[model samples]
Target: PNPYERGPDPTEDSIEAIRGPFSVATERVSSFASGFGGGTIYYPRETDEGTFGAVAVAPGFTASQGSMSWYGERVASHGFIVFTIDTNTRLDAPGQRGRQLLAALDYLVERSDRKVRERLDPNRLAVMGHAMGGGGSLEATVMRPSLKASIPLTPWHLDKTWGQVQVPTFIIGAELDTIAPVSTHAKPFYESLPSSLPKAYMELCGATHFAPNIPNTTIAKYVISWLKRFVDEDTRYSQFLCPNPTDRAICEYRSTCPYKLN
Candidate 1:
């Protein structure tokens, strides 16, 4: 038997029923400025209150948009609109890496209806990417002023000026990642940022480039808390985003896997 499957079975009578409805919409679009061209979009159900904050996610090198759908769904479930775009090209080419982020943002605004356009909080938007996509996110954050926050996971070094990012930034580095080591890749970017902008550089011990994206409740909690605090304006959720060193629950995973800052 699976050791992780000892929990009680979920039943209608055991839990509160979902009174509200939710929907998931998927689509594809064309672009003339690229090699493989176009992209796919996965949008979640929207409520009448608001369209939800949008998060544009860019995948790592040679990875498809489908690879990011898992994380995208996690963000969407937290009531924020999320977009994951594909980016596999040279580092410096225009619309190659960073431009895709802007394109994805434009797609959200242009494709959304009046209710979504008016209700969606543009100021709370965030940009996230992994590996090469992380480098692209750093470049995009600097290139575009509209991106309110940025989260770059296991980034590879493309340029030095990524430190100038002005918005609140979160750098999730992997301890065992040989491709993009924490000291070489994530640390330099963290140190490069201006001292004033709120920043958090977390090194996930024992984790590799693929580890951070693993489907774990602990990871989900941190992500949802971060987005809720910064995007949803929920101050109560701030602790999880920037946890204190002494907190036990915050560092629970650290016992098995340590995290550090520079």
Candidate 2:
């Protein structure tokens, strides 16, 4: 069963600690079978092989790898490996982005650089993305149920077809987004998901669809914390999961809150 939905250990839920320092590696993949034409990787500075969890990021429509690197930096700084990828074509659909993320994960796992592949714990990998890629993150999980977790920020999808995805998922919505309104997109995705599975929805009270990709401390905190708790199973990081760290005014909506009782 999912311990998250049952509620969290209150004592273990209050600790606060700073994130790790992240160093990113650069690589180029110029073929369709290479997952992405190119991408950036992030990892803890000087870490040993197979010691950290991993994550793959897919950029939004018409977005570039550089635009998604900040998020990679944030997640990797917290002691995980991260790869922010660029699709071969800017117009690829969400499902294509989803498949590429998994392919990128494979590329990361097989890279010759120890810092790129050896440092990651292959069994503990996660996925996240922005806008269309965000929804694609969901698509990836649906295709491969083994992913430890998935975070879809302001995701855009045509329907609630992701309901069958059983991985622990987090849905980040933008309250002010007109591109993929929370009401019609993110919220329904979250709601359509079976409550039997572990899940949460966090909304940036006044932000746009693009806000999740831009640098924001609150989102970073959640991203790192959730990856730690679910993907890495690091209980200490569980502290950041609950009771609403951001002011209720700006956070707007949160549900089942990975750690909180309410």
Which candidate achieves the best TM-score against the true structure?
2
The digit string of per-residue lDDT tens for model 1 on 30-72 reads 5442432345544455544455677777777666666666765
The CA-based lDDT of model 2 is what?
0.74
**lDDT digits (tens) for residues 1-262 of candidate 2:** 4322111232321222234444545555445546665676766665532367788888899887777877765666556778888888988888899999998888877752655665667877889989899889999999889998899989998867566888888888888999999889998899988777667788887898889777876677677777767886666565556665565535665555555221
TM-score of model number 1: 0.75
lDDT leader:
2
Give residue 159's lDDT in candidate 1 (0 to 100).
69
Quote the lDDT for 87 in model 1.
55
By summed lDDT, the worst window of 10 consecutive residues in model 2 runs over 4-13
Error of 1 at 57 (Å): 0.5
| lDDT (C-alpha) at residue 56 in model 1 | 78
